[PDB]
């Protein structure tokens, strides 16, 4: 709701002509996003995104670059929602089938880990198995309790996370992206011209989104 405070746009380099409607674009070789265009765009994204959030849907924040972590873990986990913060595996939506059995192995190995037989029979293989829980835990972290493929997708950079956008367009999932002036509005259904790599901007930004996901009529 609050006016974007401190980002005003970025990316002098590799700017994309399809971002030409969103650029004010003056200072010191770098491009300034027209935030007077961003505010209606971002309010629309909060509108439809709250609309699917009230229908009891799953949202899947996507935060692979740094420092979108742990800001996407903090914002998704502040809601009762899901996230990807480390490397987004190629095909966790379009073959979720195979990713379902990897999530199943993460559940079986944490149940085996903190409760069952973890000290049993070996030290070396037990260390091997625990670092399998680090690898499967940081890759399949947020998505491990989803149990479906989600009803929307909220990516924090459109060019850095083009794979996830390409799959959610492949599957008919609404993509909500904060694009920058280098990115491309591929199949992003609700584009938001913003700043992808400022931590102030993405914490303000995810703060608003996580605010409207759990917003409660009460």
């Amino acid at each position: 709701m609050l006016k974007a405070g401190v980002h005003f746009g970025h990316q002098t380099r590799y700017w994309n002509p399809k971002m030409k409607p969103f650029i004010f674009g003056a200072r010191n070789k770098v491009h300034i996003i027209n935030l007077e265009k961003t505010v209606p765009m971002f309010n629309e994204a909060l509108a439809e995104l709250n609309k699917i959030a009230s229908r009891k849907g799953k949202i899947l924040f996507v935060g692979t670059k740094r420092a979108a972590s742990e800001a996407v873990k903090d914002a998704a986990l502040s809601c009762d929602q899901f996230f990807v913060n480390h490397r987004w595996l190629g095909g966790m939506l379009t073959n979720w089938k195979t990713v379902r059995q990897s999530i199943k192995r993460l559940k079986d190995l944490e149940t085996q880990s903190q409760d069952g037989t973890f000290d049993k029979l070996t030290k070396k293989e037990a260390l091997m198995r625990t670092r399998e829980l680090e690898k499967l835990e940081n890759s399949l972290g947020g998505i491990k309790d989803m149990g479906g493929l989600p009803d929307a997708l909220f990516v924090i950079d459109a060019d850095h996370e083009h794979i996830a956008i390409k799959e959610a367009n492949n599957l008919g999932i609404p993509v909500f992206a904060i694009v920058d002036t280098n990115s491309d509005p591929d199949g992003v259904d609700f584009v938001i011209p913003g700043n992808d790599d400022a931590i102030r901007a993405v914490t303000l930004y995810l703060g608003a989104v996580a605010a409207t996901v759990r917003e409660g009529r009460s």
């Binding site: 650029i23 004010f24 200072r27 209606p40 599957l171 008919g172 259904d189």
Partner: protein
Amino acid sequence: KKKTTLSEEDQALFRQLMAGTRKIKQDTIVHRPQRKKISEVPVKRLIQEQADASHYFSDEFQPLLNTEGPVKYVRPDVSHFEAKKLRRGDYSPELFLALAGLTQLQAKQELGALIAACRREHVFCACVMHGHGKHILKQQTPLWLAQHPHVMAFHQAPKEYGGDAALLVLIEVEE
């Protein structure tokens, strides 16, 4: 109607704060994506849901089902009383699936579709009719159903819903 926003004068002030002349005025044709239908549910999504649901039905894996009596199954963590309720007919199925005459492959797909539909429509109880066969759908289908994570419990259907030729199935739904 225009959404509430900072005043135009305020926007101009933001423009004033912008260091330098600080104005970008490139004009280009603008294309806006059509708004998604409220109903949604595109056939492709449905097909995808079906495929996802049927993915669990393996011919190689055989869950241990009770060999004594009418066919029944309860998923670990679900109250055993649910199977009893199915037997007594406490649950009235809202969806009916007829598998009789289908190949195994077709049947798996239809079962997947049924489960997807139950989830989508928040239907908790469905009836699956497989007919009577030896080493056929009548035997293979319960095994496939058990392997599905959304299947909570099933029991031989009461006579009113097909008896020994049908199953009542309880499906886990997000509400």
